[PDB]
Amino acid sequence: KFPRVKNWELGSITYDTLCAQSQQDGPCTPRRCLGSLVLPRKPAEQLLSQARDFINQYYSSIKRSGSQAHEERLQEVEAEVASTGTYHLRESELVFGAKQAWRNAPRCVGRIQWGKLQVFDARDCSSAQEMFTYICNHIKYATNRGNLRSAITVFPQRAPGRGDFRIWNSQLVRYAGYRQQDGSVRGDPANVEITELCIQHGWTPGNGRFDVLPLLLQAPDEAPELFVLPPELVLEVPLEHPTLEWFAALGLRWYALPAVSNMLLEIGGLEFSAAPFSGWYMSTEIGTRNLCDPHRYNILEDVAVCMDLDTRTTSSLWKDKAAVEINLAVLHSFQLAKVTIVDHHAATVSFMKHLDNEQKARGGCPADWAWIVPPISGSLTPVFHQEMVNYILSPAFRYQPDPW
Amino acid sequence: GPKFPRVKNWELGSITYDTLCAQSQQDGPCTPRRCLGSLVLPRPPAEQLLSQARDFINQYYSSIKRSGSQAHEERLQEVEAEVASTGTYHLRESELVFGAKQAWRNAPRCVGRIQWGKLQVFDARDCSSAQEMFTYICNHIKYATNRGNLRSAITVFPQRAPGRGDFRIWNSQLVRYAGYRQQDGSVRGDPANVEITELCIQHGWTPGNGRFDVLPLLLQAPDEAPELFVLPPELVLEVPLEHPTLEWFAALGLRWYALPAVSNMLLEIGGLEFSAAPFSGWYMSTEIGTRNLCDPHRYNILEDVAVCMDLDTRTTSSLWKDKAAVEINLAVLHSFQLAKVTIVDHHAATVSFMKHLDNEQKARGGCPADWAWIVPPISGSLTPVFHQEMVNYILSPAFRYQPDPW
Ligand code: HEM
Ligand code: HEM
Ligand SMILES: CN(C)c1ccc(CCNCc2ccc3ccc(N)nc3c2)cc1
Ligand SMILES: CN(C)c1ccc(CCNCc2ccc3ccc(N)nc3c2)cc1
Ligand SMILES: C[C@H](O)[C@H](O)[C@H]1CNc2nc(N)[nH]c(=O)c2N1
Ligand SMILES: C[C@H](O)[C@H](O)[C@H]1CNc2nc(N)[nH]c(=O)c2N1
Ligand SMILES: [Zn+2]
């Protein structure tokens, strides 16, 4: 009926009743579970039902359901859809919707923070140059000299028969990846394609491992435009290690602000194709995935060798040892620079508290176990031992096709 | 594209389609509305038995390339006739062997499946007493332990029968350390084993008071109270744990047993149910070093080891837990190697599982796999399986969980 959900460390049991509010299919069926897949495989009455549902969520949130304002607002939406095939959100509704989308994101371990989100309304944007201005302001605000503040900037919604506003870059801060003819890649291999798009739109490339990319910003049915971010806007942290003096000589660094810019924001059936958002990093994102993934910077062996570890055999656990010191260096360096960051133990502990808040508030919480459990030391964190139910609620952040 | 799940490896960029999943006749816990993949346990008529039986016989004859043959059709008739007159049927020896291997091959939670074709199947379907089960189990342990050069094996006891009680081994594993509840509410020994420990005592076992007291076996023959059997200590190979450079680690007095021999799972083949069919392989080091030793609800030694390592246990950001865990895993690997007892680290194991996935893609068009269980509990993304999408589904023959007999 409703899923019984158990924590195996504590022996405690909840029932998820929130999942009954899901109106959107995931990829699983009784025959086979597809939960480990990264991406999904692929009229007015439909929009109207999503709109009413959202306005209802909204007025319930301010505890004014059935108010005159509530009924009038539903009529406004009804009237606008019926006449125009679409409608528009009020700023306060947009603010609520943006927070709910974050709250509903099953892959986010940082949702304890969901109610604290600065929302910049950029729906009065008419050009790539204007998008750039809004993005620079977003970055300045969120960066805040290292005392990071979560924020989202929302550009004009999609409209029928008109191209979307898009930011082509997957994040506002990305390091170039330059594909050598010698097969290899210099920089971040995750960004080979975006790096190449930039160059062919007139960017003069560098030749470094950590060259900050320009943004490709696209206003509707126009070719994207190139904008270089003012270097003083992009806060970066040089990596060093608290005891291993040689670590700094590796010339490693990372940027402060994780600002994701290729996701679609869906609120009440309306779609916001450019709505970049940022919070702060969990250390494993950088220390484990970005720096140690074999298809990213892949620095494990280098660090292992500097640590004089036995690289010849798996059973020396040289990979594990190097990874741990790498994560420590990331934590140490961010802490030294006074840049906000959270370790994977602290983050998962807060998420457990979040699950409990959400159980009392909504009778459940959608969560993606494979993404909530950190990429090192999994079972050493409480979320490993916690069963989770994954489902899609709306407002939602969604993936969308690359615009090229 | 193909109308089957597309499966991607994000490390290598490679793509496969799973067509094997089409062979699942048993639903799992998920629906289009919500994924329940992270759940540990989610929740005969002759007609029903017969189709499971026909399916298995079909699988058997395919595996020997005689599908459609005279011997194939005769075996079908024979099974149909046997169910027709008795309500059940019986497996030929070679069918049992094939089925036991296929159940292992089909287990989505097992990372060790590269080994699936190497399984010694001991037929114990003649067993008629609890004493005899014990003899069979001791023989299994001796064969499988092989003085440290471990060999995978399963011993199969008589199947469930109409109007007759089950053969059951009450213990979850052939080797289990006692868990003694203390007055302060804490547990001495392995907290995982509190219930079986107390059952052993209720059934007459004189309890020790150590952290590593090996439990006796509670063995149950049909329609009888279970009987208590003490394993001769020389049959139970254990490994004292030391660390290659941290000299104090040996002084901790930790140890683990060599043989992971699981004994409470039901082996289902062709509709037949083998309620007692203990099987054993060898350990992956993380099972001992990470879960059994560092789970908060297991031995929970993380903080103790971190203090010995002089780490800052007052703050999460020192990564004291991660550091201690790595050294404990290393100690397990070092100690087993020193003792010449078969063991596999989580890198070697996952690498071989990636090879297994490729073998099965070509052999069967897919491989059912539970990502949450396949990815090791430390260093997740440092292993190749983390970056491999997987499809999970139930195939038969199968190992299944079954209710505790009490
Ligand atoms: C405030 C500190 C935050 C922390 C520590 C945090 C943590 C994380 C982590 C570790 C992930 C996994 C990402 C990956 O492995 O690629 C993630 C994903 C995600 N986060 Fe959060 N987050 C924070 C703030 C936010 C904010 C402000 C938003 C949006 C308003 C957000 C929305 C999301 C979404 C939609 C995902 C899934 C994205 C995907 O599927 O790629 N998070 N978060
Ligand atoms: C040969 C070396 C083997 C290795 C290294 C290995 C490794 C593993 C590991 C690490 C697990 C996860 C267990 C847990 O976390 O509790 C597992 C599960 C499992 N293994 Fe294997 N295994 C091996 C042999 C076998 C054999 C011989 C069988 C049966 C004939 C088998 C059947 C299973 C089954 C059914 C599970 C699921 C356990 C459950 O759901 O409780 N394995 N294996
Ligand atoms: C298709 N590919 C290559 C691909 C798809 C999804 C991903 C996941 C990206 N997730 C990035 C992301 C998103 C939101 C975040 C919020 C906070 C935070 N600290 N990190 C965050 C990180 C990566 C690669
Ligand atoms: C309901 N409870 C308490 C519970 C449920 C499932 C489990 C999973 C136990 N799986 C153990 C297991 C099974 C088969 C194995 C085969 C080989 C190997 N090395 N380890 C192996 C380990 C444990 C407890
Ligand atoms: C195949 C697998 O689903 C994929 O590698 C996932 C696993 N869990 C993850 N978890 C997080 N936080 N981020 C990720 O990118 C991934 N990748
Ligand atoms: C809640 C979660 O399903 C549970 O802790 C699982 C996760 N993955 C696992 N993976 C393995 N190999 N063994 C386990 O016991 C578990 N436990
Ligand atoms: Zn699922």
Coordinates of C-alpha atoms in Angstrom, one line a residue, chain A:
Chain A
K1 CA 0.0 0.0 0.0
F2 CA 2.2 2.7 1.4
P3 CA 5.9 1.9 1.8
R4 CA 7.1 0.9 5.2
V5 CA 10.6 2.6 5.6
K6 CA 13.1 1.3 8.1
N7 CA 16.4 2.6 9.6
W8 CA 18.6 -0.4 10.1
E9 CA 21.0 1.2 12.6
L10 CA 18.2 2.4 14.9
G11 CA 15.5 -0.2 14.3
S12 CA 13.0 2.7 13.7
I13 CA 10.2 2.6 11.2
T14 CA 8.2 5.2 9.3
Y15 CA 5.5 5.0 6.6
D16 CA 5.7 7.3 3.5
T17 CA 2.3 8.7 2.6
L18 CA 3.7 11.7 0.7
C19 CA 4.5 9.4 -2.3
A20 CA 0.8 9.3 -3.0
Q21 CA 1.1 13.0 -4.1
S22 CA 3.3 12.0 -7.0
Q23 CA 1.8 12.6 -10.4
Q24 CA 4.9 11.7 -12.5
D25 CA 6.3 8.3 -13.4
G26 CA 9.8 7.3 -12.6
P27 CA 11.6 4.6 -14.6
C28 CA 10.9 1.5 -12.5
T29 CA 8.2 -1.2 -13.0
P30 CA 7.3 -4.3 -11.0
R31 CA 9.4 -6.3 -13.5
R32 CA 12.7 -4.4 -13.1
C33 CA 14.2 -1.6 -11.0
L34 CA 16.0 1.2 -13.0
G35 CA 16.8 3.4 -10.0
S36 CA 20.6 3.5 -10.7
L37 CA 20.0 5.2 -14.1
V38 CA 21.5 8.7 -14.2
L39 CA 19.1 10.2 -16.7
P40 CA 15.5 9.5 -17.7
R41 CA 15.4 7.2 -20.8
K42 CA 13.5 9.9 -22.8
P43 CA -3.0 20.6 -23.8
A44 CA -4.7 23.2 -21.5
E45 CA -6.6 20.8 -19.3
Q46 CA -3.2 19.2 -18.4
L47 CA -1.6 22.6 -17.7
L48 CA -4.7 23.8 -15.9
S49 CA -4.6 20.8 -13.5
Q50 CA -0.9 21.3 -12.8
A51 CA -1.6 25.1 -12.2
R52 CA -4.6 24.6 -9.9
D53 CA -2.6 22.0 -7.9
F54 CA 0.3 24.4 -7.5
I55 CA -1.8 27.4 -6.5
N56 CA -3.4 25.1 -4.0
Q57 CA 0.0 24.1 -2.6
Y58 CA 0.8 27.8 -2.4
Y59 CA -2.3 29.0 -0.5
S60 CA -2.1 26.0 1.8
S61 CA 1.5 27.0 2.6
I62 CA 0.4 30.5 3.7
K63 CA -2.5 28.8 5.4
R64 CA -5.2 30.6 3.4
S65 CA -6.9 27.7 1.6
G66 CA -10.4 28.5 0.5
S67 CA -9.8 32.2 1.1
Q68 CA -11.2 34.8 -1.2
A69 CA -7.7 35.5 -2.5
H70 CA -7.3 31.7 -3.2
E71 CA -10.5 31.4 -5.2
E72 CA -9.8 34.7 -7.2
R73 CA -6.3 33.5 -8.0
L74 CA -7.5 30.2 -9.3
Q75 CA -9.9 32.2 -11.5
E76 CA -7.1 34.4 -12.8
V77 CA -5.1 31.3 -13.8
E78 CA -8.1 29.6 -15.3
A79 CA -9.0 32.7 -17.3
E80 CA -5.4 33.2 -18.5
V81 CA -4.9 29.6 -19.7
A82 CA -8.4 29.5 -21.4
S83 CA -7.6 32.6 -23.4
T84 CA -3.9 32.3 -24.0
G85 CA -2.9 28.7 -23.5
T86 CA -0.6 29.6 -20.6
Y87 CA -0.4 31.8 -17.5
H88 CA 2.1 33.6 -15.3
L89 CA 3.2 33.3 -11.7
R90 CA 3.3 36.1 -9.1
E91 CA 6.7 36.7 -7.5
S92 CA 5.7 35.3 -4.1
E93 CA 4.4 32.1 -5.9
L94 CA 7.6 31.8 -7.8
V95 CA 9.6 32.2 -4.5
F96 CA 7.5 29.4 -2.9
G97 CA 7.8 27.2 -6.0
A98 CA 11.6 27.6 -6.2
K99 CA 12.0 26.5 -2.6
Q100 CA 9.6 23.5 -3.1
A101 CA 11.5 22.3 -6.1
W102 CA 14.7 22.2 -4.1
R103 CA 12.8 20.6 -1.2
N104 CA 11.4 18.0 -3.6
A105 CA 14.8 17.1 -5.2
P106 CA 15.5 13.5 -4.2
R107 CA 19.2 13.6 -5.1
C108 CA 20.0 16.5 -2.8
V109 CA 21.7 15.8 0.5
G110 CA 21.6 19.5 1.4
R111 CA 17.9 19.9 1.8
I112 CA 18.0 20.8 5.5
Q113 CA 18.7 24.3 4.0
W114 CA 15.6 24.3 1.7
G115 CA 13.7 27.2 3.3
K116 CA 16.8 29.5 3.2
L117 CA 17.0 30.4 -0.5
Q118 CA 17.5 33.9 -2.0
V119 CA 15.3 34.1 -5.1
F120 CA 16.2 36.6 -7.8
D121 CA 13.3 37.3 -10.3
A122 CA 14.9 37.8 -13.7
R123 CA 11.7 37.2 -15.7
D124 CA 12.1 40.8 -17.1
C125 CA 15.1 39.7 -19.1
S126 CA 15.2 40.4 -22.9
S127 CA 18.7 39.7 -24.0
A128 CA 21.9 37.7 -23.4
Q129 CA 23.7 40.8 -22.2
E130 CA 20.9 41.3 -19.6
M131 CA 21.3 37.6 -18.6
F132 CA 25.0 38.2 -18.0
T133 CA 24.3 41.1 -15.6
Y134 CA 21.8 39.0 -13.6
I135 CA 24.4 36.2 -13.5
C136 CA 27.2 38.4 -12.3
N137 CA 24.9 39.8 -9.6
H138 CA 23.9 36.2 -8.6
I139 CA 27.5 35.2 -8.3
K140 CA 28.5 38.3 -6.2
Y141 CA 25.5 37.7 -3.9
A142 CA 26.0 34.0 -3.4
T143 CA 29.8 34.1 -3.1
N144 CA 29.6 36.8 -0.4
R145 CA 33.4 36.8 0.1
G146 CA 33.4 33.1 1.0
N147 CA 30.4 33.2 3.4
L148 CA 28.3 31.4 0.8
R149 CA 24.6 32.1 0.5
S150 CA 22.2 29.8 -1.4
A151 CA 20.5 31.5 -4.3
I152 CA 18.5 31.0 -7.5
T153 CA 18.0 33.4 -10.5
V154 CA 15.0 32.8 -12.6
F155 CA 14.9 33.8 -16.3
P156 CA 11.7 34.0 -18.5
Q157 CA 9.7 30.8 -18.7
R158 CA 9.4 28.8 -21.9
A159 CA 6.7 30.0 -24.3
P160 CA 5.1 28.0 -27.2
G161 CA 6.7 28.4 -30.7
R162 CA 9.6 30.5 -29.3
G163 CA 13.1 29.4 -28.5
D164 CA 14.2 29.1 -24.8
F165 CA 16.4 31.3 -22.8
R166 CA 19.4 28.9 -22.0
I167 CA 22.7 29.0 -20.3
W168 CA 24.8 26.5 -22.3
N169 CA 27.3 25.9 -19.6
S170 CA 26.4 23.1 -17.1
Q171 CA 27.7 25.3 -14.2
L172 CA 28.5 29.0 -14.0
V173 CA 32.0 28.1 -13.1
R174 CA 33.7 25.3 -15.2
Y175 CA 37.3 24.6 -15.9
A176 CA 38.3 24.1 -19.6
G177 CA 39.1 20.7 -20.9
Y178 CA 41.4 20.8 -24.0
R179 CA 41.4 17.6 -26.1
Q180 CA 44.9 16.8 -27.3
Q181 CA 45.5 15.0 -30.5
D182 CA 47.6 12.7 -28.4
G183 CA 44.3 11.3 -27.1
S184 CA 44.6 12.8 -23.6
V185 CA 42.8 15.7 -22.1
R186 CA 44.3 18.7 -20.4
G187 CA 41.9 20.2 -17.8
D188 CA 38.5 18.8 -16.9
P189 CA 37.4 16.1 -19.3
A190 CA 33.8 16.7 -18.2
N191 CA 34.0 20.0 -20.1
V192 CA 35.6 19.0 -23.4
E193 CA 32.5 19.7 -25.4
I194 CA 31.6 23.0 -23.7
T195 CA 35.2 24.2 -24.0
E196 CA 35.1 23.5 -27.8
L197 CA 31.8 25.3 -28.2
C198 CA 33.3 28.3 -26.5
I199 CA 36.4 28.4 -28.8
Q200 CA 34.3 28.2 -32.0
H201 CA 32.2 31.1 -30.8
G202 CA 35.3 33.2 -30.6
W203 CA 36.9 32.4 -27.2
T204 CA 40.7 32.6 -27.2
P205 CA 41.6 29.5 -25.2
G206 CA 44.4 29.1 -22.5
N207 CA 46.5 26.0 -22.0
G208 CA 46.1 25.4 -18.3
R209 CA 44.6 22.7 -16.1
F210 CA 42.2 25.2 -14.4
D211 CA 41.2 27.8 -17.0
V212 CA 37.8 29.2 -16.1
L213 CA 35.5 29.1 -19.0
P214 CA 33.4 32.0 -20.5
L215 CA 29.6 31.6 -20.4
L216 CA 27.6 30.9 -23.6
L217 CA 24.2 32.7 -22.9
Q218 CA 21.3 32.3 -25.3
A219 CA 18.3 34.6 -25.7
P220 CA 15.4 33.1 -27.7
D221 CA 16.1 32.1 -31.3
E222 CA 19.4 33.8 -31.3
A223 CA 22.9 32.3 -31.5
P224 CA 24.4 32.2 -28.0
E225 CA 26.8 35.0 -26.9
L226 CA 30.1 34.8 -25.2
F227 CA 30.8 36.6 -21.9
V228 CA 34.0 36.3 -19.8
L229 CA 33.4 36.4 -16.1
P230 CA 35.4 39.1 -14.2
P231 CA 38.2 37.0 -12.5
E232 CA 37.5 38.9 -9.2
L233 CA 34.0 37.4 -9.2
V234 CA 35.2 33.9 -9.3
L235 CA 36.5 32.9 -5.9
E236 CA 38.9 29.9 -5.9
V237 CA 40.7 27.9 -3.2
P238 CA 44.2 26.7 -3.8
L239 CA 44.5 23.2 -2.3
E240 CA 47.0 22.4 0.3
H241 CA 47.3 19.7 3.0
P242 CA 47.7 20.3 6.7
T243 CA 50.7 18.0 7.2
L244 CA 51.8 16.8 3.7
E245 CA 53.9 19.8 2.6
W246 CA 54.3 18.5 -1.0
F247 CA 50.6 18.6 -1.7
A248 CA 50.5 22.3 -2.5
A249 CA 53.2 21.7 -5.1
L250 CA 50.6 19.6 -7.1
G251 CA 49.2 23.0 -8.1
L252 CA 45.6 21.9 -7.4
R253 CA 42.7 24.3 -6.8
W254 CA 38.9 24.4 -7.0
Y255 CA 36.2 27.1 -7.1
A256 CA 34.1 28.1 -4.2
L257 CA 30.6 28.3 -5.7
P258 CA 28.7 25.3 -7.1
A259 CA 26.2 27.0 -9.4
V260 CA 24.3 24.6 -11.6
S261 CA 22.8 26.2 -14.7
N262 CA 21.5 23.6 -17.1
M263 CA 18.5 22.3 -15.2
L264 CA 14.9 23.1 -16.0
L265 CA 12.7 24.4 -13.2
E266 CA 9.0 23.3 -13.4
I267 CA 6.4 25.1 -11.3
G268 CA 2.7 24.6 -11.8
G269 CA 3.2 23.3 -15.2
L270 CA 5.3 26.3 -16.3
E271 CA 8.8 25.7 -17.3
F272 CA 11.9 27.8 -16.6
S273 CA 14.7 26.6 -19.0
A274 CA 17.2 28.9 -17.4
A275 CA 17.1 29.2 -13.6
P276 CA 20.7 28.7 -12.3
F277 CA 21.0 28.0 -8.7
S278 CA 23.9 27.7 -6.2
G279 CA 24.5 26.5 -2.6
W280 CA 27.9 25.4 -1.2
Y281 CA 30.0 22.3 -1.8
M282 CA 30.0 19.1 0.2
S283 CA 33.7 18.2 0.3
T284 CA 33.5 14.8 -1.4
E285 CA 32.1 16.4 -4.6
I286 CA 35.5 18.0 -5.2
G287 CA 37.9 15.7 -3.2
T288 CA 36.4 12.4 -4.4
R289 CA 34.4 12.8 -7.6
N290 CA 35.9 15.9 -9.4
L291 CA 39.5 15.2 -8.5
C292 CA 39.6 11.3 -8.2
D293 CA 37.1 10.1 -10.8
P294 CA 39.1 8.3 -13.5
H295 CA 37.3 10.3 -16.2
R296 CA 37.8 13.6 -14.4
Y297 CA 41.1 14.9 -13.0
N298 CA 42.1 11.4 -12.0
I299 CA 44.8 12.5 -9.5
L300 CA 44.8 9.3 -7.3
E301 CA 47.9 7.7 -8.7
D302 CA 49.9 11.0 -8.6
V303 CA 49.0 11.6 -4.9
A304 CA 49.6 8.0 -4.1
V305 CA 53.1 8.2 -5.6
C306 CA 53.9 11.4 -3.7
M307 CA 52.7 9.5 -0.5
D308 CA 55.2 6.7 -1.4
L309 CA 52.4 4.1 -1.4
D310 CA 52.6 0.7 -3.0
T311 CA 50.8 1.3 -6.3
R312 CA 51.5 -2.2 -7.6
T313 CA 48.6 -4.0 -5.9
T314 CA 45.0 -3.2 -4.9
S315 CA 45.3 -4.7 -1.5
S316 CA 47.6 -2.0 -0.1
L317 CA 44.4 0.2 -0.3
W318 CA 46.6 3.0 -1.8
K319 CA 43.6 4.3 -3.7
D320 CA 41.6 4.6 -0.4
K321 CA 44.5 6.2 1.5
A322 CA 45.1 8.8 -1.2
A323 CA 41.5 9.7 -1.6
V324 CA 41.1 10.3 2.1
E325 CA 44.1 12.7 2.2
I326 CA 42.7 14.4 -0.9
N327 CA 39.3 15.0 0.8
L328 CA 41.2 16.3 3.9
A329 CA 43.1 18.8 1.8
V330 CA 39.9 20.1 0.3
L331 CA 38.4 20.5 3.8
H332 CA 41.5 22.0 5.2
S333 CA 42.0 24.5 2.4
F334 CA 38.4 25.7 2.3
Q335 CA 38.5 26.1 6.1
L336 CA 41.7 28.1 5.8
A337 CA 40.3 30.3 3.1
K338 CA 37.1 30.9 5.2
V339 CA 35.0 29.5 2.3
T340 CA 31.8 27.6 3.2
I341 CA 32.0 23.9 2.8
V342 CA 30.5 20.9 4.6
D343 CA 32.1 17.5 5.1
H344 CA 30.1 14.3 4.2
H345 CA 29.6 13.3 7.9
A346 CA 28.1 16.6 8.9
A347 CA 26.0 16.8 5.7
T348 CA 24.4 13.3 6.1
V349 CA 23.8 14.0 9.8
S350 CA 21.8 17.1 8.9
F351 CA 20.0 15.1 6.2
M352 CA 18.8 12.6 8.8
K353 CA 17.4 15.5 10.7
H354 CA 15.8 16.7 7.5
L355 CA 14.1 13.3 6.9
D356 CA 12.7 13.5 10.4
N357 CA 11.5 17.1 9.9
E358 CA 9.8 16.1 6.6
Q359 CA 8.2 13.0 8.2
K360 CA 6.4 15.3 10.6
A361 CA 5.6 18.0 8.1
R362 CA 4.6 16.0 5.0
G363 CA 4.6 12.3 6.0
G364 CA 7.6 11.5 4.0
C365 CA 10.6 12.7 1.9
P366 CA 11.6 11.6 -1.6
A367 CA 15.2 10.5 -1.6
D368 CA 17.7 8.8 -4.0
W369 CA 19.8 6.5 -1.8
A370 CA 22.5 6.0 -4.5
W371 CA 23.0 9.8 -4.6
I372 CA 22.5 10.6 -0.9
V373 CA 25.1 8.1 0.2
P374 CA 28.6 9.8 -0.3
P375 CA 31.2 8.3 -2.7
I376 CA 33.7 7.5 0.1
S377 CA 33.0 6.0 3.5
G378 CA 29.4 5.1 2.6
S379 CA 28.4 2.9 5.6
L380 CA 30.3 5.2 7.9
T381 CA 27.5 7.8 7.5
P382 CA 23.9 7.4 8.9
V383 CA 22.2 7.6 5.6
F384 CA 23.7 4.3 4.4
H385 CA 21.6 2.5 7.0
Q386 CA 18.4 4.4 6.2
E387 CA 15.9 2.9 3.7
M388 CA 14.6 5.6 1.3
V389 CA 11.6 6.0 -1.1
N390 CA 12.2 7.7 -4.4
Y391 CA 9.5 9.5 -6.4
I392 CA 8.8 12.7 -8.3
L393 CA 7.0 15.6 -6.7
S394 CA 6.3 19.0 -8.4
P395 CA 7.6 21.8 -8.3
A396 CA 10.7 20.0 -9.6
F397 CA 14.2 20.5 -11.0
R398 CA 14.5 18.4 -14.2
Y399 CA 17.2 17.6 -16.7
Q400 CA 16.6 19.0 -20.2
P401 CA 18.3 18.4 -23.6
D402 CA 21.5 20.3 -24.4
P403 CA 20.5 23.2 -26.6
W404 CA 22.9 22.4 -29.4

